Amino acid sequence: NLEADIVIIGAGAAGCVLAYYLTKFSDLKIILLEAGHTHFNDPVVTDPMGFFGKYNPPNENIRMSQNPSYAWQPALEPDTGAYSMRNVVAHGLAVGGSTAINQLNYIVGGRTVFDNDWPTGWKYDDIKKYFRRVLADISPIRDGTKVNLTNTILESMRVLADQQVSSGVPVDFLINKATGGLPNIEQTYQGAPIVNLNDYEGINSVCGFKSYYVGVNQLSDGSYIRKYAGNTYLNSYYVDSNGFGIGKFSNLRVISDAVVDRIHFEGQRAVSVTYIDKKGNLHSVKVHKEVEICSGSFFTPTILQRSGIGDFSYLSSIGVPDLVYNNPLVGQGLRNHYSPITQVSVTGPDAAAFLSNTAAGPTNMSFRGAGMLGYHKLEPNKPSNAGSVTYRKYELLVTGGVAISADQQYLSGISSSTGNYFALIADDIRFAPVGYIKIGTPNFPRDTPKIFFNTFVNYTPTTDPADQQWPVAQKTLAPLISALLGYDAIYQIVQQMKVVAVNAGFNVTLQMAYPPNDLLVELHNGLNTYGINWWHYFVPSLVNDDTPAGKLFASTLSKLSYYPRSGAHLDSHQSCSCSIGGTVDTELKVIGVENVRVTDLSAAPHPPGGNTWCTAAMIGARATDLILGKPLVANLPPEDVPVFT
Amino acid sequence: NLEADIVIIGAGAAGCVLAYYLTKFSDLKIILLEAGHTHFNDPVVTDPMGFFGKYNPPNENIRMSQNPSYAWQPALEPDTGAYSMRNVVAHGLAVGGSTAINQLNYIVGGRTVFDNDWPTGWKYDDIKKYFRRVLADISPIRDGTKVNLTNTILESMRVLADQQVSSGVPVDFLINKATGGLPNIEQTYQGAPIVNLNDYEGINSVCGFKSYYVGVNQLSDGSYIRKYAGNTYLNSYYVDSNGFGIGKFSNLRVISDAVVDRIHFEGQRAVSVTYIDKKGNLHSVKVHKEVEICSGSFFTPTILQRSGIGDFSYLSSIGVPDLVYNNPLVGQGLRNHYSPITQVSVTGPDAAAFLSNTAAGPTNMSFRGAGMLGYHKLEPNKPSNAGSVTYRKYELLVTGGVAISADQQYLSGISSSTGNYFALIADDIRFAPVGYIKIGTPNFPRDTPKIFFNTFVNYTPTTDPADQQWPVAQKTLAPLISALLGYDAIYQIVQQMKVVAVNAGFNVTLQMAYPPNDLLVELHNGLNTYGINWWHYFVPSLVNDDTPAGKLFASTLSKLSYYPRSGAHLDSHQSCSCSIGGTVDTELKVIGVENVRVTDLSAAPHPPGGNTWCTAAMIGARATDLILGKPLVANLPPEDVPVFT
Ligand SMILES: Cc1cc2nc3c(=O)[nH]c(=O)nc-3n(C[C@H](O)[C@H](O)[C@H](O)COP(=O)(O)OP(=O)(O)OC[C@H]3O[C@@H](n4cnc5c(N)ncnc54)[C@H](O)[C@@H]3O)c2cc1C
Ligand SMILES: Cc1cc2nc3c(=O)[nH]c(=O)nc-3n(C[C@H](O)[C@H](O)[C@H](O)COP(=O)(O)OP(=O)(O)OC[C@H]3O[C@@H](n4cnc5c(N)ncnc54)[C@H](O)[C@@H]3O)c2cc1C
Structure with missing residues (x-):
C-alpha cells in the first residue's frame, strides 16, 4: 500500500x-x-x-x-x-x-x-x-573573454540609439523609459562594468550586453x-x-x-x-x-x-x-516563442582575425551576446501602453558559423566550407x-x-469593402509584420557595423547573404516611402495600385515571405x-x-x-x-x- | 575504554x-x-x-x-x-x-x-x-675550527658589499638596512667575535658568518x-x-x-x-x-x-x-623551498692545502658557512617594501666534494675522482x-x-599585444628569473675569490665548471647590456629583435634553463x-x-x-x-x- x-x-x-x-x-x-x-x-x-x-x-x-x-x-x-x-x-x-x-x-x-x-x-x-x-x-x-564582434555590435547600437532618442518617436526599438529615455548599453573597453539584464528591480527591459x-x-x-x-x-x-x-x-x-x-x-x-x-x-x-x-x-x-x-x-x-x-x-x-535566422558574409584581408574566439565553449555555448530590443516604430499591433512603457519584443542573438539547414545551404550556396559567416537571430518574444x-x-x-x-496563415480577400476588412487582415498578418520588422531591425544595424568596423582599424566588408541584401534595401526604400501603411501590400488585391512602384514593393514582400517559413527553428x-x-x-x-x-x-x-x-x-x-x-x-x-x- | x-x-x-x-x-x-x-x-x-x-x-x-x-x-x-x-x-x-x-x-x-x-x-x-x-x-x-675557504668567501663578500653600499642602489643583494646601511660581515682572524644569525631582536636579516x-x-x-x-x-x-x-x-x-x-x-x-x-x-x-x-x-x-x-x-x-x-x-x-646546485674547480700547486678540513663532521655535518643574502638588484618580483626593508631571499651554503647526481657527473665529466671541487648552493627562501x-x-x-x-612552467605566447601580456609572463617566469639571478650572484663572487686568494699568498685558480663559466660570462654581459629588461628574452617571439646580440643572449638563456630543472635537490x-x-x-x-x-x-x-x-x-x-x-x-x-x- x-x-x-x-x-x-x-x-x-x-x-x-x-x-x-x-x-x-x-x-x-x-x-x-x-x-x-x-x-x-x-x-x-x-x-x-x-x-x-x-x-x-x-x-x-x-x-x-x-x-x-x-x-x-x-x-x-x-x-x-x-x-x-x-x-x-x-x-x-x-x-x-x-x-x-x-x-x-x-x-x-x-x-x-x-x-x-x-x-x-x-x-x-x-x-x-x-x-x-x-x-x-x-x-x-x-563568460569574461573579449570578442571584437560584440564590441562592434554594441557600439553600432549606441550610434543608432542616439538618433532614436532624438526625433521624439515614443515606441522605437532602441528606447528605454525606465532609464529616463535611453537604454544603458554596456561599455566597450577592458573590464568595463557589466550590465546584468536580470536586474532585481527590472530597470532594464531594453538593453545591450555582452554575454549571457x-x-x-x-x-x-x-x-x-x-x-x-x-x-x-x-x-x-x-x-x-x-x-x-x-x-x-x-x-x-x-x-x-x-x-x-x-x-x-x-x-x-x-x-x-x-x-x-x-x-x-x-x-x-x-x-x-x-x-x-x-x-x-x-x-x-x-x-x-x-x-x-x-x-x-x-x-x-x-x-x-x-x-x-x-x-x-x-x-x-x-x-x-519563434526564431527566424539570418546570415552575414565577411570579405577583407583580416576577417579571420575579426572572428576569433567565437567557437562554442563550456561557458558560452555558442552565444556571443548581444542585445534585447523592443517594438519597431512601424509595428501596428502594439498594446495601448506602448507609448508610456517599453516592451520586450525581440531577443537578439549572435553566433559564429552557419545556422541554416543543409537544404537551405544548398539553395543559397553559402556553406561553412567558405569561412565568412556569422548569424543574427531575432527571437520573437510576444x-x-x-x-x-x-x-x-x-x-x-x-x-x-x-x-x-498554425503560424503564417495568409489572408484571403473577400468582397467586403476594404474599410472594414483591413482590421482583420492586420490581426491575421500580425506574425508576418513582426518578422518583417525584425528583418528591418537587423538590416539597419549592419551599416553602422560597417562604419564602426572600418573606423576601429578593421578593413573588412559586411553584407547579408541570407536573406539577400537587395531584397532588404528594396524593403527599406518601400518602408520609408510608404509609411505605416507598408503592410497594406501583403494583399495587392486591396490597395488597387497599378503604379509599378507599389507593384514592385508587393512583389518584394511576396518573395521575401518565403524565408521565415523555411529558414527557422521552432522554439x-x-x-x-x-x-x-x-x-x-x-x-x-x-x-x-x-x-x-x-x-x-x-x-x-x-x-x-x-x-x-x-x-x-x-x-x-x-x-x-x-x-x-x-x-x-x-x-x-x-x-x-x-x-x- | x-x-x-x-x-x-x-x-x-x-x-x-x-x-x-x-x-x-x-x-x-x-x-x-x-x-x-x-x-x-x-x-x-x-x-x-x-x-x-x-x-x-x-x-x-x-x-x-x-x-x-x-x-x-x-x-x-x-x-x-x-x-x-x-x-x-x-x-x-x-x-x-x-x-x-x-x-x-x-x-x-x-x-x-x-x-x-x-x-x-x-x-x-x-x-x-x-x-x-x-x-x-x-x-x-x-664549530670553532678554522678553514681558509670560508675566510676567502667572507673577505670577497666584504669587498663586494663595499661597492654595493656606494652607488646608492636600495635593494641590491648585499645590503642591510637595520645595520644602518651595511650588513655586519663576520671578521677574519683568530678568534674573531662571532656573528649569531639568530639574534634575539632580528637585527641581522642579511649577514655573513662562518658556521651554523x-x-x-x-x-x-x-x-x-x-x-x-x-x-x-x-x-x-x-x-x-x-x-x-x-x-x-x-x-x-x-x-x-x-x-x-x-x-x-x-x-x-x-x-x-x-x-x-x-x-x-x-x-x-x-x-x-x-x-x-x-x-x-x-x-x-x-x-x-x-x-x-x-x-x-x-x-x-x-x-x-x-x-x-x-x-x-x-x-x-x-x-x-628549493635549492639548485653549482660546482667549482681548483687548479694550482697547493689547492689540496687550500681545502683541508672540509670533510663532514659530527659538529658541522658537511656545512662550511657561509652567508645569507637578499634580492638581487634586477629582480622584478619584489614586494613594495623592498626599498625600505631588507628581505631574506637566498640562503648561501658551501661544502667540499661533489654534490651533483652521478648522471650529471657523467654528462659534465667532473667527478670527485679528480680532487678539485666544492659546491655553492643558493637555497631560495621566497x-x-x-x-x-x-x-x-x-x-x-x-x-x-x-x-x-609544478615549478618551472615556461610561457606560451599568444596573439595578445605584448603591452598587456608581459605582466603575466613575468609572474609565470618568476622562478626562472630568481634562479638565474642567484646564478649571477654566485658567479660574481668567484672573481673576488680569485683576487683575495691570490692576494692572501695562495696560488690557485678558480673557475666554475657546472654550470660552465662561459655561459655565465655571456649572461653577465647580457645582463649589464640589457638592463632590467634582460628577462624579456625568455620568450624570443615577443621582443622581435633579429639583431644577433639579442638572438645569442636568448639562446644562452634557453640553453642555461636546463640546469635548474636537472641538477637540483627538492627541499x-x-x-x-x-x-x-x-x-x-x-x-x-x-x-x-x-x-x-x-x-x-x-x-x-x-x-x-x-x-x-x-x-x-x-x-x-x-x-x-x-x-x-x-x-x-x-x-x-x-x-x-x-x-x-
Ligand atoms: C532543446 C531544448 C532547449 C532548451 N533551451 C533552453 C534555453 O536556452 N533556456 C532555458 O531557459 N530553457 C531551455 N530549455 C528548457 C525549457 O525552456 C524549460 O526549462 C522547460 O519548459 C521546463 O519546464 P517544466 O520543467 O515545467 O516542464 P518539463 O520539464 O517538461 O516537466 C515534465 C516532466 O514530467 C515528467 N512526466 C511527464 N509525463 C509524466 C507522467 N505521465 N508521469 C510521470 N512523469 C511524467 C517528464 O519526464 C518531465 O520530467 C530547453 C529545453 C529543450 C528541450
Ligand atoms: C631529509 C630531511 C632533512 C631535513 N633537514 C633539516 C634541516 O637541515 N634543518 C631543519 O631545521 N629541519 C630539517 N628537517 C626537518 C624539517 O624541516 C622539519 O623539522 C619538519 O617540518 C618538522 O615538522 P613537524 O614536526 O610539524 O612535522 P612532522 O615531523 O612530519 O610531524 C608528523 C608526525 O606525525 C606522525 N603521524 C603522521 N600521520 C599520523 C597518523 N595518522 N597517526 C599518528 N601519527 C601520525 C608522523 O609519524 C610524525 O611523527 C629535515 C627533514 C628531513 C626529512
Missing part, C-alpha cells in the same frame, strides 16, 4: 523546486512520481560540451532532443502556414525534466510583462522575491558541468539512491520510473492515482489531501482529460469512461499564434497527442496550457473540485520575456507558499543554497 | 612541545597518538655520523629519508616544469617526527617575514619569546649525539617505558604505534577518534574537550577530509560517507610555486596522497597547508566546528626564512598558550631546560 497526501506528478523544473522546499518546511508524506532516471554519471549530460556531440559514437551522431532515451517526442499536426510541415519538439525525460536536456539560459522576464499581463497577486513586486530565490539557488556564471547566464559551475579541477533542477534540489545528499529521503527529508519518496495514467476519482474529491512501473505492474497511491501536476505544458491537459475533467461532448465522442466536470477550456491557448491540445486515446500516457499550431519554449482564469483560479486550484491543483508552466496566463525556465521555477516556489499558507521561501535569506553533491 | 579530552595526533616537532608544556602546566588527561617507536638505542639515529651511513650493512647503503622503516614515502605527481619527473619526499616516522631523520638546522626566520607576512597577534615582537624558549631548550652548538647551528650535544666522553624533539621533551625521565607519565606528568599517555584514521563526529562537536594498533585492533578514544592535529603538512589535510570537513562535491564524488562542513580551502596552498593536496581513498592513512606541485621543507585565514582563524581553531584545532606547520600563512624546524616548535608553544588561556611558557625564565636523559 502506498498511501499519500502530497502527490507530485513529474519532477520538471517546477516539480523539483516544489517538492524540495515543500519537504524542507513541512512534515507531510510526499510521493514524487517522475518517470525518468538520474543521469548523475552519464558524461554526455554532465559535460555541457556533450550537448554538442563530443561523446556520440560515430554511427549515431544525434542530439539528445531527438534521442528517445532522453526526451518525449510529440509530433505536431501540419502547419498550414509553413507549407504543411510537421514539427517535433521535446519535453525532457529525466529527474529535473526539460532542464536535463536544455540550452541553459536564465532570462527572468521583465517588470512590464508581469505587471500589465499577469493577474492580481502575481505582479512583478509580488513575486520578485521568488525569482531572487531561484536565481540565487542556481548561481549561474558568465548559463547553468554551469566551474569545478576546482578545470571542467565545467551542467547545473539543473535535479542536480540542485534532488541529489545524493537529500534523497537515497533507492528513492528515499535522508534525515531532515525523511518523509520524501521518489518513484523514479513511473508513468501516471489518470487520477481515480470519487465524488468530486480525487482519491487515488495510478502509475506503471518498469516491470509492468500497476500500483495505486492513495491521496489524502491533494495531488500536484507539474508534468509540462503538453502532457498536463492530457492528464486532466484522462482523469475525467474536460469537455464532455468531445471526450464522450472518443469514449473516456468517466466524466467529472465540463470545462471546455482545458488545455486551450498554447503559446510559444509571438501571436495560439493553439490547443487534445487526446486521441483514453488508454495511457502516449508520446504524441493532437497538437494544432521548445512551450507555455500557457491551463492558464489562470481559464481552468484555475489565482490559487492555481482547479475549478470544479476541491483537492487537485496545477502548479507548472501550463498555468501561466502569458508567456514571459525569455527562455521559459525561471518562470516555472518561480511558480513552483509560489505554489509551495500557497499550499503552506505562509511565506518562508520569500523570507529565507538569499544566500542559503541547497547543498551540492 | 580510553576516554580523553586532550588528544594530540602526532608527535612531530610541534606535537612534542605542545604535549610536554601542556602537561607541565595543566592537569587534564592527555593522549598522544604517535605511530612510531622511540629509537633511543639505535646507534645510527643517535650518532649524527649515522646520517651518513657509517652503520649501514654493505648490501643496503641507503639514507633514512628513503628507508621505509624510518619515513613516510609520498610520491608527488609528475612536475610539468621539470620534464615530468616525480619526486619522493619524507615525513618522519618516530617520536619527535621529522626531527629524528633531519639535517639539524636552526634558522629562526627574521623580523621582516613575520612582521609584514604574518597576521595580527603573530608579529615578530609578539612571538619572539617563544622562539627564545625553544632555541634555549635545544641549546645547539657550533646544529642539534648535537658534545658528551663528556667524546662522542656527539642527536638532540631532537623526542629526545628533549619525551625521554625516560618523564614518560614510562610503556607509555605512561611519571609523577608530575602522571596524566600523560603515549600510545606509541597508532595510526589515526578519522575523527568520528557528532552534531558539530567531534566526539571520538579511531586508531589502529600494531596487533590489528581498532580502538576508540572518547573526546571530551578538544582534539589536536600535529601530523605534518602532508597528512593533516588528509585527516581533515577523512574526518568529514572539506569540499563536498569532490569528497562526495570519491565517496566519503559523512559530510560535515564545506570548506573548499582545505589543504590548499602548499609551499616549499620560492613562488604553490600546490595542493587531495586524497584518493577514503579508507585509511596511506603513504601517498595526490600531490600536485623537504614543506609548509603552509591549512593556513590562517584559509581554514582556521588566529586562534588556530578550525572554522565550522567548536572543538578541533590545528597546531602544526601546515597552519603557517607564509614560509619562514630558514630550515622550517624552529617555526613549528614556536607554533606548538603558542598553541599551548592559546589553549591554556595564560602565558607561562613566555613567562618561564629562559634558563630552565627540561631534563636530559
Whole structure:
C-alpha cells in the first residue's frame, strides 16, 4: 500500500523546486512520481560540451532532443502556414525534466510583462522575491573573454540609439523609459562594468550586453558541468539512491520510473492515482489531501482529460469512461516563442582575425551576446501602453558559423566550407499564434497527442469593402509584420557595423547573404516611402495600385515571405496550457473540485520575456507558499543554497 | 575504554612541545597518538655520523629519508616544469617526527617575514619569546675550527658589499638596512667575535658568518649525539617505558604505534577518534574537550577530509560517507623551498692545502658557512617594501666534494675522482610555486596522497599585444628569473675569490665548471647590456629583435634553463597547508566546528626564512598558550631546560 497526501506528478523544473522546499518546511508524506532516471554519471549530460556531440559514437551522431532515451517526442499536426510541415519538439525525460536536456539560459522576464499581463497577486513586486530565490539557488556564471564582434555590435547600437532618442518617436526599438529615455548599453573597453539584464528591480527591459547566464559551475579541477533542477534540489545528499529521503527529508519518496495514467476519482474529491512501473505492474497511491501536476505544458491537459475533467461532448465522442466536470477550456491557448535566422558574409584581408574566439565553449555555448530590443516604430499591433512603457519584443542573438539547414545551404550556396559567416537571430518574444491540445486515446500516457499550431496563415480577400476588412487582415498578418520588422531591425544595424568596423582599424566588408541584401534595401526604400501603411501590400488585391512602384514593393514582400517559413527553428519554449482564469483560479486550484491543483508552466496566463525556465521555477516556489499558507521561501535569506553533491 | 579530552595526533616537532608544556602546566588527561617507536638505542639515529651511513650493512647503503622503516614515502605527481619527473619526499616516522631523520638546522626566520607576512597577534615582537624558549631548550652548538675557504668567501663578500653600499642602489643583494646601511660581515682572524644569525631582536636579516647551528650535544666522553624533539621533551625521565607519565606528568599517555584514521563526529562537536594498533585492533578514544592535529603538512589535510570537513562535491564524488562542513580551502596552498646546485674547480700547486678540513663532521655535518643574502638588484618580483626593508631571499651554503647526481657527473665529466671541487648552493627562501593536496581513498592513512606541485612552467605566447601580456609572463617566469639571478650572484663572487686568494699568498685558480663559466660570462654581459629588461628574452617571439646580440643572449638563456630543472635537490621543507585565514582563524581553531584545532606547520600563512624546524616548535608553544588561556611558557625564565636523559 502506498498511501499519500502530497502527490507530485513529474519532477520538471517546477516539480523539483516544489517538492524540495515543500519537504524542507513541512512534515507531510510526499510521493514524487517522475518517470525518468538520474543521469548523475552519464558524461554526455554532465559535460555541457556533450550537448554538442563530443561523446556520440560515430554511427549515431544525434542530439539528445531527438534521442528517445532522453526526451518525449510529440509530433505536431501540419502547419498550414509553413507549407504543411510537421514539427517535433521535446519535453525532457529525466529527474529535473526539460532542464536535463536544455540550452541553459536564465532570462527572468521583465517588470512590464508581469505587471500589465499577469493577474492580481502575481505582479512583478509580488513575486520578485521568488525569482531572487531561484536565481540565487542556481548561481549561474558568465563568460569574461573579449570578442571584437560584440564590441562592434554594441557600439553600432549606441550610434543608432542616439538618433532614436532624438526625433521624439515614443515606441522605437532602441528606447528605454525606465532609464529616463535611453537604454544603458554596456561599455566597450577592458573590464568595463557589466550590465546584468536580470536586474532585481527590472530597470532594464531594453538593453545591450555582452554575454549571457548559463547553468554551469566551474569545478576546482578545470571542467565545467551542467547545473539543473535535479542536480540542485534532488541529489545524493537529500534523497537515497533507492528513492528515499535522508534525515531532515525523511518523509520524501521518489518513484523514479513511473508513468501516471489518470487520477481515480470519487465524488468530486480525487482519491487515488495510478502509475506503471518498469516491470509492468500497476500500483495505486492513495491521496489524502491533494495531488500536484507539474508534468509540462503538453502532457498536463492530457492528464486532466484522462482523469475525467474536460469537455464532455468531445471526450464522450472518443469514449473516456468517466466524466467529472465540463470545462471546455482545458488545455486551450498554447503559446510559444519563434526564431527566424539570418546570415552575414565577411570579405577583407583580416576577417579571420575579426572572428576569433567565437567557437562554442563550456561557458558560452555558442552565444556571443548581444542585445534585447523592443517594438519597431512601424509595428501596428502594439498594446495601448506602448507609448508610456517599453516592451520586450525581440531577443537578439549572435553566433559564429552557419545556422541554416543543409537544404537551405544548398539553395543559397553559402556553406561553412567558405569561412565568412556569422548569424543574427531575432527571437520573437510576444509571438501571436495560439493553439490547443487534445487526446486521441483514453488508454495511457502516449508520446504524441493532437497538437494544432498554425503560424503564417495568409489572408484571403473577400468582397467586403476594404474599410472594414483591413482590421482583420492586420490581426491575421500580425506574425508576418513582426518578422518583417525584425528583418528591418537587423538590416539597419549592419551599416553602422560597417562604419564602426572600418573606423576601429578593421578593413573588412559586411553584407547579408541570407536573406539577400537587395531584397532588404528594396524593403527599406518601400518602408520609408510608404509609411505605416507598408503592410497594406501583403494583399495587392486591396490597395488597387497599378503604379509599378507599389507593384514592385508587393512583389518584394511576396518573395521575401518565403524565408521565415523555411529558414527557422521552432522554439521548445512551450507555455500557457491551463492558464489562470481559464481552468484555475489565482490559487492555481482547479475549478470544479476541491483537492487537485496545477502548479507548472501550463498555468501561466502569458508567456514571459525569455527562455521559459525561471518562470516555472518561480511558480513552483509560489505554489509551495500557497499550499503552506505562509511565506518562508520569500523570507529565507538569499544566500542559503541547497547543498551540492 | 580510553576516554580523553586532550588528544594530540602526532608527535612531530610541534606535537612534542605542545604535549610536554601542556602537561607541565595543566592537569587534564592527555593522549598522544604517535605511530612510531622511540629509537633511543639505535646507534645510527643517535650518532649524527649515522646520517651518513657509517652503520649501514654493505648490501643496503641507503639514507633514512628513503628507508621505509624510518619515513613516510609520498610520491608527488609528475612536475610539468621539470620534464615530468616525480619526486619522493619524507615525513618522519618516530617520536619527535621529522626531527629524528633531519639535517639539524636552526634558522629562526627574521623580523621582516613575520612582521609584514604574518597576521595580527603573530608579529615578530609578539612571538619572539617563544622562539627564545625553544632555541634555549635545544641549546645547539657550533664549530670553532678554522678553514681558509670560508675566510676567502667572507673577505670577497666584504669587498663586494663595499661597492654595493656606494652607488646608492636600495635593494641590491648585499645590503642591510637595520645595520644602518651595511650588513655586519663576520671578521677574519683568530678568534674573531662571532656573528649569531639568530639574534634575539632580528637585527641581522642579511649577514655573513662562518658556521651554523646544529642539534648535537658534545658528551663528556667524546662522542656527539642527536638532540631532537623526542629526545628533549619525551625521554625516560618523564614518560614510562610503556607509555605512561611519571609523577608530575602522571596524566600523560603515549600510545606509541597508532595510526589515526578519522575523527568520528557528532552534531558539530567531534566526539571520538579511531586508531589502529600494531596487533590489528581498532580502538576508540572518547573526546571530551578538544582534539589536536600535529601530523605534518602532508597528512593533516588528509585527516581533515577523512574526518568529514572539506569540499563536498569532490569528497562526495570519491565517496566519503559523512559530510560535515564545506570548506573548499582545505589543504590548499602548499609551499616549499628549493635549492639548485653549482660546482667549482681548483687548479694550482697547493689547492689540496687550500681545502683541508672540509670533510663532514659530527659538529658541522658537511656545512662550511657561509652567508645569507637578499634580492638581487634586477629582480622584478619584489614586494613594495623592498626599498625600505631588507628581505631574506637566498640562503648561501658551501661544502667540499661533489654534490651533483652521478648522471650529471657523467654528462659534465667532473667527478670527485679528480680532487678539485666544492659546491655553492643558493637555497631560495621566497620560492613562488604553490600546490595542493587531495586524497584518493577514503579508507585509511596511506603513504601517498595526490600531490600536485609544478615549478618551472615556461610561457606560451599568444596573439595578445605584448603591452598587456608581459605582466603575466613575468609572474609565470618568476622562478626562472630568481634562479638565474642567484646564478649571477654566485658567479660574481668567484672573481673576488680569485683576487683575495691570490692576494692572501695562495696560488690557485678558480673557475666554475657546472654550470660552465662561459655561459655565465655571456649572461653577465647580457645582463649589464640589457638592463632590467634582460628577462624579456625568455620568450624570443615577443621582443622581435633579429639583431644577433639579442638572438645569442636568448639562446644562452634557453640553453642555461636546463640546469635548474636537472641538477637540483627538492627541499623537504614543506609548509603552509591549512593556513590562517584559509581554514582556521588566529586562534588556530578550525572554522565550522567548536572543538578541533590545528597546531602544526601546515597552519603557517607564509614560509619562514630558514630550515622550517624552529617555526613549528614556536607554533606548538603558542598553541599551548592559546589553549591554556595564560602565558607561562613566555613567562618561564629562559634558563630552565627540561631534563636530559
Ligand atoms: C532543446 C531544448 C532547449 C532548451 N533551451 C533552453 C534555453 O536556452 N533556456 C532555458 O531557459 N530553457 C531551455 N530549455 C528548457 C525549457 O525552456 C524549460 O526549462 C522547460 O519548459 C521546463 O519546464 P517544466 O520543467 O515545467 O516542464 P518539463 O520539464 O517538461 O516537466 C515534465 C516532466 O514530467 C515528467 N512526466 C511527464 N509525463 C509524466 C507522467 N505521465 N508521469 C510521470 N512523469 C511524467 C517528464 O519526464 C518531465 O520530467 C530547453 C529545453 C529543450 C528541450
Ligand atoms: C631529509 C630531511 C632533512 C631535513 N633537514 C633539516 C634541516 O637541515 N634543518 C631543519 O631545521 N629541519 C630539517 N628537517 C626537518 C624539517 O624541516 C622539519 O623539522 C619538519 O617540518 C618538522 O615538522 P613537524 O614536526 O610539524 O612535522 P612532522 O615531523 O612530519 O610531524 C608528523 C608526525 O606525525 C606522525 N603521524 C603522521 N600521520 C599520523 C597518523 N595518522 N597517526 C599518528 N601519527 C601520525 C608522523 O609519524 C610524525 O611523527 C629535515 C627533514 C628531513 C626529512
